[PDB]
Design a binder for this molecule. Structure first.
Ligand SMILES: O=C1N=C(NCc2cccs2)S/C1=C/c1ccc2ncccc2c1
Lengths: 298, 257
């Protein structure tokens, strides 16, 4: 409310968790917007759209994409968002090897943690944090986007949908089939993304759940009861899992300082209970000299 | 638990914003509290039939009450609103929601699929897509963490009491979910263990036994009169071992406040 008459489509940007995303222009105010188009001729309004709209209408924060309007209905549903610049995946694809400086990385992680802390404090799990669902503007901001796979959770959690999270970024408690997962799954994903920005390659690029697990184990060590109490009783744990020694973080992420390595390790802790919360992470010494650098224009 | 407090604060804020209009039934020319009781009782059976979460039930009722707070509905269309609400709650809350055709099925084919889908849209428009409502259930699960120690009978009985509250818009429409949850928890705790609304929760919630008294007196009476109520689906449900047979427990005769 809101009317499609006032928008001029510019181009298709791509496809999200659901729907199709277009760049467009408000003809009256001049605002450049993103439109997420959902075709209703498929069972009524999809649960993904119902959840994203409901949750995004609640979440007003500088590091969460701004949902401006919902235009309904014409056999089509359109979500109208503020338009930024580019998603982080495309940014990284467009960046020269030296094109993403450590101060920009620090700033991006700091802001993603703020956005995530806000979600979690408002009982929302995102459950699909990966570079493509993160959006940057030209002024140094990064925002969480695509809440199509998100859900409003309870205290304490019940069992929710199993997998959940695109594989490379999926937490070991999900892979091992735990009946309960909670806010820690989003932190795992951000830890993976942090490593990926630093080294410019995916931390754990598996092609199946077992491949994904073994990749995680080769880096972090195969988990046991000492490191993660209860692990050997989890549904998809196997006594036959190969044993690998934990790697040194200086070798996992060479460009990273001591504080950076410390934060990464806390974000990739096996035990979701010990894994750092987004809120506690904001006060980590890594962020002592954080600023807000600008990215390149691609 | 790094967000327990943050989340509870937020839900307290949202429950005020998500609260239906206390006096709406008097502004409905064709429907009544009695017909609403019939509807909600029916949704309990639907929830049982499709093994839906209790939370889903609480959500659908919130959606119905909010919808009826601004939309006049004829008695012939009340079940349609309820069906569309249950479909929406299921989509929001359930891992595997029942298909639309299954919701068409349980209306005994009074309404078509197209009507159910059109009502879904209307409900969404009227609620402006704001479906993440706090429920009695969401407060109860948090309150349960304050048990010393945890008691399965207390938990199911509190859930049973909170669910009974859904049936009777007079008086429960005037109480917030966090208050009904507090009254339900106290009364469950008292019935099973003799214990009382504990100090850790007085301090978490700001609610005293005294502030809970008005709701607690009503819920007490509801609990005592439960076997005599015209709607019985919640009592029948809570006989099941799934809920530890708590509807077979005897209500205490006095509360001694
Ligand atoms: O960017 C968005 N991405 C979404 N899901 C995954 C996709 C990434 C790229 C295409 S689809 S929903 C979404 C909305 C949105 C909002 C603002 C934007 N600003 C600049 C570029 C893309 C934007 C997308």
């Amino acid at each position: 409310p809101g009317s499609m008459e006032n928008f001029q489509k510019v181009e298709k940007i791509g496809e999200g968790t659901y729907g199709v995303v277009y760049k467009a222009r408000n003809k009256l105010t001049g605002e450049v917007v993103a439109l997420k188009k959902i075709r209703l001729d498929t069972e009524g309004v999809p649960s993904t759209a119902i959840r994203e709209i409901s949750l995004l209408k609640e979440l007003n924060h500088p590091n969460i994409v701004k949902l401006l309007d919902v235009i309904h209905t014409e056999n089509k549903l359109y979500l109208v968002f503020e338009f930024l610049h580019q998603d982080l995946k495309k940014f990284m694809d467009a960046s020269a090897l030296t094109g993403i400086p450590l101060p920009l990385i620090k700033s991006y992680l700091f802001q993603l943690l703020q956005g995530l802390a806000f979600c979690h404090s408002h009982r929302v799990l995102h459950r699909d944090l990966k570079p493509e669902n993160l959006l940057i503007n030209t002024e140094g901001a990064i925002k969480l986007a695509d809440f199509g796979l998100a859900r409003a959770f309870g205290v304490p959690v019940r069992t929710y949908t199993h997998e959940v999270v695109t594989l490379w970024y999926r937490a070991p408690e999900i892979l091992l089939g735990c009946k309960y997962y909670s806010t820690a799954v989003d932190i795992w994903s951000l830890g993976c993304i942090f490593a990926e920005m630093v080294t410019r390659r995916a931390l754990f690029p598996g092609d199946s759940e077992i491949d994904q697990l073994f990749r995680i184990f080769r880096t972090l060590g195969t988990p046991d009861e000492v490191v993660w109490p209860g692990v050997t009783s989890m549904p998809d744990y196997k006594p036959s899992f190969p044993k690998w020694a934990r790697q040194d973080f200086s070798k996992v992420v060479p460009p990273l300082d001591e504080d950076g390595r410390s934060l990464l390790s806390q974000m990739l802790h096996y035990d979701p209970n010990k894994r750092i919360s987004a809120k506690a992470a904001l006060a980590h010494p890594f962020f002592q000299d954080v600023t807000k650098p600008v990215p390149h224009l691609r | 638990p790094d967000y327990h407090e943050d989340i509870h604060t937020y839900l307290r804020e949202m429950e005020v914003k998500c609260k239906p209009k206390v006096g709406y039934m008097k502004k409905q020319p064709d429907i009544t509290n009695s017909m609403r009781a019939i509807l909600v009782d029916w949704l309990v059976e639907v929830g049982e039939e499709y093994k839906l979460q209790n939370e889903t039930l609480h959500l659908a009722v919130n959606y119905i009450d909010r919808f009826l707070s601004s939309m006049s509905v004829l008695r012939g269309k009340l079940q349609l609103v309820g069906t569309a609400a249950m479909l929406l709650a299921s989509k929001f809350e359930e891992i595997y929601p029942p298909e639309v055709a299954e919701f068409v099925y349980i209306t005994d084919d009074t309404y078509t699929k197209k009507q159910v889908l059109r009502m879904e849209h209307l409900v969404l428009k009227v609620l402006t897509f704001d479906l993440a409502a706090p429920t009695v259930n969401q407060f109860l699960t948090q309150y349960f963490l304050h048990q010393q120690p945890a008691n399965c009978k207390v938990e199911s009985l509190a859930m049973f009491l909170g669910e009974l509250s859904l049936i009777d818009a007079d008086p429960y429409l005037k109480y917030l979910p966090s208050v009904i949850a507090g009254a339900a928890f106290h009364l469950a705790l008292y019935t099973v263990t003799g214990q009382s609304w504990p100090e850790s929760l007085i301090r978490k919630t700001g609610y005293t036994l005294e502030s809970l008294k008005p709701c607690l007196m009503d819920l007490h009476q509801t609990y005592l009169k439960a076997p005599q109520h015209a709607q019985q689906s919640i009592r029948e449900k809570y006989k099941n071992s799934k809920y530890h047979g708590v509807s077979l427990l005897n209500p205490p005769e006095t509360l001694n406040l």
